[PDB]
Amino acid sequence: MSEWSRIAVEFGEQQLNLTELEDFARELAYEGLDPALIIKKLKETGGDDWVKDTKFIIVFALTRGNKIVKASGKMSNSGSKRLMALQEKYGLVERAETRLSITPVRVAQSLPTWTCAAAAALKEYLPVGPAVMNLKVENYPPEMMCMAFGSLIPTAGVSEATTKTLMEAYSLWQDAFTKTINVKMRGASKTEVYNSFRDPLHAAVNSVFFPNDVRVKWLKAKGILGPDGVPSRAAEVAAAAYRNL
Amino acid sequence: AMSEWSRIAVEFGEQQLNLTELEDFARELAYEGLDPALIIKKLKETGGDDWVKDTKFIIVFALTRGNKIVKASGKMSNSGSKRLMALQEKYGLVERAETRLSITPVRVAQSLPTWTCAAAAALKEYLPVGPAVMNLKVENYPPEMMCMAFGSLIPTAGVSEATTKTLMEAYSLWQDAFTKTINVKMRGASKTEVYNSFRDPLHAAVNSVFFPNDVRVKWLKAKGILGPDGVPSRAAEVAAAAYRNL
Amino acid sequence: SEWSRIAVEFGEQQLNLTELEDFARELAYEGLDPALIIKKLKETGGDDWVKDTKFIIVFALTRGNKIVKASGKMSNSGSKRLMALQEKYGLVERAETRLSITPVRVAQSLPTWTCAAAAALKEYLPVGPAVMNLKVENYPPEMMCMAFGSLIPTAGVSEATTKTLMEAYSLWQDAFTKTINGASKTEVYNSFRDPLHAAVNSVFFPNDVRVKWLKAKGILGPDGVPSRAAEVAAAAYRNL
Amino acid sequence: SEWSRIAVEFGEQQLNLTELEDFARELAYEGLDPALIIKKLKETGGDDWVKDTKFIIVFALTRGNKIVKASGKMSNSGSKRLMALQEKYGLVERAETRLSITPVRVAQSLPTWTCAAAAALKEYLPVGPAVMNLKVENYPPEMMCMAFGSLIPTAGVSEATTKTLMEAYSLWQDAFTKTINVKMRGASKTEVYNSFRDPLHAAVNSVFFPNDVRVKWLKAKGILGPDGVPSRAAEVAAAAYRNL
Amino acid sequence: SEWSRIAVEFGEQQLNLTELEDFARELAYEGLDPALIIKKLKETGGDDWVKDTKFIIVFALTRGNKIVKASGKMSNSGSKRLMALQEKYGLVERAETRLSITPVRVAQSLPTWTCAAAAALKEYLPVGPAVMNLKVENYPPEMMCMAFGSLIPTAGVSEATTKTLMEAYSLWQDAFTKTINVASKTEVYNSFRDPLHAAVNSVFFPNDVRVKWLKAKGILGPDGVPSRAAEVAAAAYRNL
């Protein structure tokens, strides 16, 4: 029949350019953030002040999240003043809407080794910390209690089983966190909340921005990986705890 | 002993049905997912020779991210985001099919189903509902089946109605998993509730005459989804059984 | 005080049971005024109203009330004529007022036609033989639309007949309600109870015509009692 | 530190109990001012107010407060007169203020008539014998309305009688709340109870409608025996509410 | 590989535990500035501020924050002075800023009085003895309000005392939250952990007066250990 049908049929008769297809898919794949863009942004706008500012912003992200106004009305006076000051200074937003967009949580994810260290030190101040986690498992790794830990899970220099175990241990926290903050998820299967965070996690782990060798070294320094390159008992127990539901 | 309007209602109900005009009305009014010819014509007329490549990029986007252009554009590589925005403005791509003229990436993908499905098979690990999800339900779920375009490739002719039924069930396994995995509305949703969420686009795609049945059959045989005898492969059969079994 | 005194005395009055019953009926739920719809259609469309109405009813049966959404998802000719008719008759998608003209209200305004057309168009219905055959043998196709409630007689047949027919139809109403909108049987029954009782109890469509029609379609026998298929369908709903 | 000192000194004050109870009573939940409603109706309608009010109450009992919406789905005559009365008395669909006159408030202002009418019009009620009979046999029809709380006596009967009546009525309040409030069908017994607790106790403890008349009326309808204790239907309904 | 180097180096910095803790405290949840509330009340109301504040607190205890909705649902006199006070002090129904003055914040600014009044007004509380007796015998009435958290001392008593008191009170917080907030024990615990700890860890209201007050009310023994009612309530909270 139509000319248009012949075109569709012929279109499906073309050879696939595999390399170019893979390139397109990678170009279009889920990306949580562009860390390099964010760091460039911070360093260029804040000057030498950018480190201090960034640390404070990260403390805010860790303890209160992205809701700048709503919290700011809800803290100490100096804290509020400074939070708003940083807000105007850096063009902070409460919601991640664009590739250029800078949220506090994105800042925290942009500097994961610092953020996770700070989170461990400020465990008692976390929205989902030891209070929630010790109930599920004994001695959950404090470095794991934040959105940035995904960036520190290595895909190289370790076995695939190690990577998997770490991802499950972290998945315990991701699940509990998602449930504790989302309206949507009060009663939901392990699998849907898992689906609510699968893309950011796989993207975070597979990202090439933060070097794997540094990840491995850092995990070893915190005792989350042994000197042998396999997960600590806390990691294994947490992983088992996530698998069991 | 009845009112004027009542008499009119009764007389109206005493008329003979013109069966042919009725079937015609039903067909005119029946569900139609898209006009592929309209989409292709618009794309080709707007893009000229670049329309082929551009379309391929758009289809990769549809396969991996869906229709939500802006939101997804915020969560991807720089090159991808750039070309995506460029193509949207260039072709007037929209995120929702609200009109027959609305051009969504998914409608584009569905307009070129053999290519879309081949690309889907090639881009297996990048799909939202792919081998990771499918392997848990069944062994070797056909990768060409893992996309919204496969429905258009199911033949109603050149095969038994049983073959068609089987293929539709095998594909329904993927449709079920996909619907549950992306359509947040479908929480706690029964097998039948989610089935009904895709019953119409699927039946419309299969019975559609835009894409010729013989080509469908030939293509399915070439991809080994149909055997040389014209019946579903063992993998297709297992997928169908897996769907019937829940 | 004096206001308490007035309240008490007010409560000392005898109830006028019949005047009360009329007030209740006047104020009771009413899905539509069929005479109003038909009159408006005829006045607006002129002689063309018959053809237009039949087309509109086919749309109501197969796609429902959502004109814009459906017009985006149908053939060109279908969409064009649908939008044209919307403009022509001022069709709306939701009934908010007594004057609101939705496709479903039209279909319900011409129930003997609508149910006949629905039977002829079994395969195009959202909830048809595919769904019904799973539940029961030989479900009457005329029952498979929103218009059938109006054809259930309250007179010229026993009340057991009326109840039975209402249960048989309740099977379809149940399935339809679930597929177009998991709640209890009674909850969903409650989702359609009022439009149904209103449709059955309406005096617009004459009972004798209803019974004659049901007889002609073999839903009631020459004897005036439900067919075997009707009895079984009713049992199928009583039985959940 | 001066503010802290002030805070401490404030908490070192002696409590004036009568002053506190006065404030609490002044601030406690109040569903409506019936005298206000009746006075407004009578002053506005004149001699016609009785007829008008009865029609309004039938509307409240059968359709609720949504005047325009309901006028959309009713007979022509019903719609015409409903809108006419709405216009005439300045009826509103929602109680935002003490002066707001809603149909349900009108019904609650004249509870003995409202409840008698509800019993007579049981088959027309949104939550009537169809629903209630499933839970209990012969649930008192006078209880099947928003006005019955006002008819439960706090005087002239035992405290146990009052409690029993309140539980029996709570069966209907529970069912009603569940059928009309969209939110509450996945809501526990206690959760739905808390949704109507305050209006109910305000209705029972209210002093507008005299207790002796309540008792006499309940006796006349056989909800109370000649002995002043709840009938078997009331007792069974109460048990049914306690049992969930 | 230029930005990555910066990212790694940033994570190679030393943590300043003290400045970090300082940032955390600065950014942590804080329910109110009692000094600002009291200063505004006293300066606006003059000699009258005491009368006003008490009335406002009774309103907070019995009705909460929703002034406009509640004013339509109370006695005429109550509604009138409530509206008058509302305008007089610029009272609002929701705390959006440190300057927002809600009735509940007023109540929490004067916790020893509020808790005393709450005990005296036991029968008028939304979650009072009726609810509490079902969970435990002799639950302390001073605990049946949002202000009690501020009176739990962190000093001048053993750390064990603080634990039992906070758990005993957590029982009321649980019941209250369930009754008004719109569901496991720990999940709802998370709904009130931050305000509870902020109230308990805040230093505006001196610990020695807290302890003294608790002794006077018999929640603490003469030696400074929890009453039997407190421990039984605590056990009752930890159990399920």
For residue C24, give the nearest of D53, D109, D121 by CB distance. Answer: D121
Distance of alpha carbon A72 from its chain centroid, rounded? 24
Q: With an 8 Å Cβ cutoff, are D210 and C4 in contact?
A: yes
Interface contacts B/C by beta carbons within 8 Å: 101
**C-alpha span between B84 and B89 (Å, rounded):** 9
Q: How near does any CA of chain D get to the CA of C114, in Å?
A: 22
Q: 3-class SS at A223?
A: coil
Cα–Cα–Cα angle for E98, E104, E109, rounded to 5 degrees: 65
Chains touching A (3+ CB pairs < 8 Å): B, E
Token pair for B150: 């496969």
Q: Which residues from chain E sit within 8 angstroms of residue D24, using beta carbons?
A: 58, 62, 121, 124
Token pair for D213: 């008349």
Token pair for A204: 């975070």
Q: How many residues does chain D have?
A: 244
Q: Which residues from chain A sit within 8 angstroms of residue B212, using beta carbons?
A: 5, 9
* C-alpha distances out from residue C57 to B214, C48, C88, C179, Å: 37, 14, 15, 20
Token pair for E35: 């000094």
| The one-letter amino acid at B62 | A
SS3 content of chain B, % helix, strand, coil (to 5): 65, 0, 35
- CB distance E152 to E172 below 8 Å: no
Distance of alpha carbon C122 from its chain centroid, rounded? 17
Q: What is the resolution of this structure in A?
A: 2.3
Residue B138 has, within 13 A of its CA and on its CB side, a CA count of: 26
Contacting B residues, span 99-158, partner chain A, CB-CB under 8 Å: 111-115, 118-119, 122-123, 126
- CB distance C10 to D110 below 8 Å: yes
**C-alpha span between D107 and D91 (Å, rounded):** 13
CA end-to-end distance (rounded Å), chain C? 55
Q: Which of C127, C148, C41 is nearest to C88 (CA)?
A: C41
Q: Which of D213, D225, D160, D170 is nearest to D192 (CA)?
A: D170
For residue D20, give the nearest of E39, E76, E117 by CB distance. Answer: E117
Q: Which residues from chain E sit within 8 angstroms of residue D188, using beta carbons?
A: none
Q: Which residues from chain A sit within 8 angstroms of residue E2, using beta carbons?
A: 36
> Residue E38 forms beta bridges with which residues?
none
- CB distance A78 to E26 below 8 Å: yes
Token pair for B154: 């199911």
Q: At what angle do helices E3-10 and A112-121 cross, to 10 degrees?
A: 20
* C-alpha distances out from residue B90 to B93, B216, D243, Å: 8, 32, 67
Q: How many residues does chain A have?
A: 245
Which one of A13, A15, A23, A24 would you mutate to disrupt binding with B, by most B Cβ within 10 Å of its Cβ?
A24
Q: Would you tell me how many other CB atoms lie within 10 Å of the CB of residue C33?
A: 20
Cα–Cα–Cα angle for B3, B8, B11, rounded to 5 degrees: 125
For residue A118, give the nearest of E15, E25, E98 by CB distance. Answer: E15
Counting other chains too, the contacts that B86-89 makes at CB distance below 8 Å and 24 or more residues apart are: B87/B54, B87/B57, B87/B58
Query: Hey, is the C-beta of D4 within 8 angstroms of any chain E C-beta?
Result: yes
Residue D58 has, within 13 A of its CA and on its CB side, a CA count of: 27
Alpha helices in chain C (DSSP H): 2-10, 17-27, 34-45, 49-63, 67-71, 76-89, 103-109, 111-120, 129-135, 159-180, 185-201, 207-216, 228-238
Q: 3-class SS at B34?
A: coil
Token pair for A166: 């770490």
Query: Hey, is the C-beta of B19 within 8 angstroms of any chain C C-beta?
Result: yes
Residues 6+ apart with CB under 8 A from E126: E62, E64, E176, E179, E180
Q: With an 8 Å Cβ cutoff, are C112 and B19 in contact?
A: no
Q: Which residues from chain C sit within 8 angstroms of residue D82, using beta carbons?
A: 27
- Tokens 């499950």 correspond to A168
Interface contacts C/D by beta carbons within 8 Å: 99
Way it was determined: X-ray
Q: With an 8 Å Cβ cutoff, are B5 and C38 in contact?
A: yes
**C-alpha span between A157 and A217 (Å, rounded):** 10
Residues 6+ apart with CB under 8 A from D12: E112
Query: Hey, is the C-beta of E213 within 8 angstroms of any chain D C-beta?
Result: yes
**C-alpha span between C67 and C59 (Å, rounded):** 9
**C-alpha span between A60 and A125 (Å, rounded):** 10
Q: Which of D165, D183, D164, D185 is nearest to D175 (CA)?
A: D185
**C-alpha span between A111 and C197 (Å, rounded):** 66
Query: Hey, is the C-beta of A78 within 8 angstroms of any chain E C-beta?
Result: yes
**C-alpha span between D68 and D80 (Å, rounded):** 11
Q: Give the DSSP H or E segment for E225.
A: none
Q: How near does any CA of chain E get to the CA of A57, in Å?
A: 10
Nearest CA in chain E to D33: E75
**C-alpha span between B216 and B235 (Å, rounded):** 18
DSSP state of E220: B
Q: 3-class SS at E96?
A: coil
